[PDB]
C-alpha cells in the first residue's frame, strides 16, 4: 500500500504525469485509487504598484501549489520497476511513503 503525494506549481503538468504514474493498468493489476484531487494552497503577495508613494495603487500576485494523491494498493515488483527512469515533467515533485 504505497503513498504518493504529488505537487507542483502547474496543474496541466500534474494531471498529465499523475496519469503517467497510473500506468500499472487502468484496473487489472493493482487496484489504483484514481488521481486524487486534494485542495491547492494559495500564497498571495500584494505589492504597491510604483516605487515611492501612491498608496492606493496595488497589484496582486499569487503562487498556487496543486496537490494530488493517487495511491496504489498491493505493489507487485514490476509495478515498482516502472517507477524508475519514466518521467518528463520538470516542475512536478514526488513524495513517496508506504
Amino acid at each position: 500500500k504505497i503513498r504518493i503525494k504529488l505537487r507542483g506549481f502547474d496543474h496541466k503538468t500534474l494531471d498529465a504525469s499523475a496519469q503517467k504514474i497510473v500506468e500499472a493498468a487502468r484496473r487489472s493489476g493493482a487496484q489504483v485509487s484514481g488521481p486524487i484531487p486534494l485542495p491547492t494552497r494559495v500564497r498571495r503577495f500584494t505589492v504597491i504598484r510604483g516605487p515611492f508613494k501612491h498608496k492606493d495603487s496595488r497589484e496582486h500576485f499569487e503562487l498556487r501549489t496543486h496537490n494530488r494523491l493517487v495511491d496504489i494498493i498491493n505493489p507487485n515488483r514490476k509495478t515498482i520497476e516502472q517507477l524508475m527512469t519514466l518521467d518528463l515533467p520538470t516542475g512536478v515533485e514526488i513524495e513517496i511513503k508506504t
Binding site: 506549481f9 502547474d10 500564497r43 498571495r44 503577495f45 505589492v47 504597491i48 504598484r49 516605487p51 497589484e59 496582486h60 500576485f61 499569487e62 503562487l63 498556487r64 501549489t65 516542475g91
Partner: protein
C-alpha cells in the same frame, strides 16, 4: 542603498537582533517579502519577467 551598508553581509551580527533583511537584488531594506528575499519593487519586476516560477497575476 549605500554599498557600505551591506554589513548585512556581517555573518556574525554580534547580537541576533541586529540581523535584518535587504533585497538580495537591489538592497532595499523595507518590503522584503521573506519568501522571495526580494523587496516589493523587485518582486513585481521579476514577476512580470516570468522569472518567479509559478507566480502569476492574481484575480478573484
Amino acid at each position: 542603498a549605500r554599498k557600505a551598508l551591506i554589513e548585512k553581509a556581517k555573518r556574525t551580527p554580534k547580537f541576533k537582533v541586529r540581523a535584518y533583511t535587504r533585497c538580495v537584488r537591489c538592497g532595499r531594506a523595507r518590503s522584503v517579502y521573506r519568501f522571495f528575499g526580494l523587496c516589493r519593487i523587485c518582486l513585481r519586476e521579476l514577476a512580470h519577467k516570468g522569472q518567479l516560477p509559478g507566480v502569476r497575476k492574481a484575480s478573484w
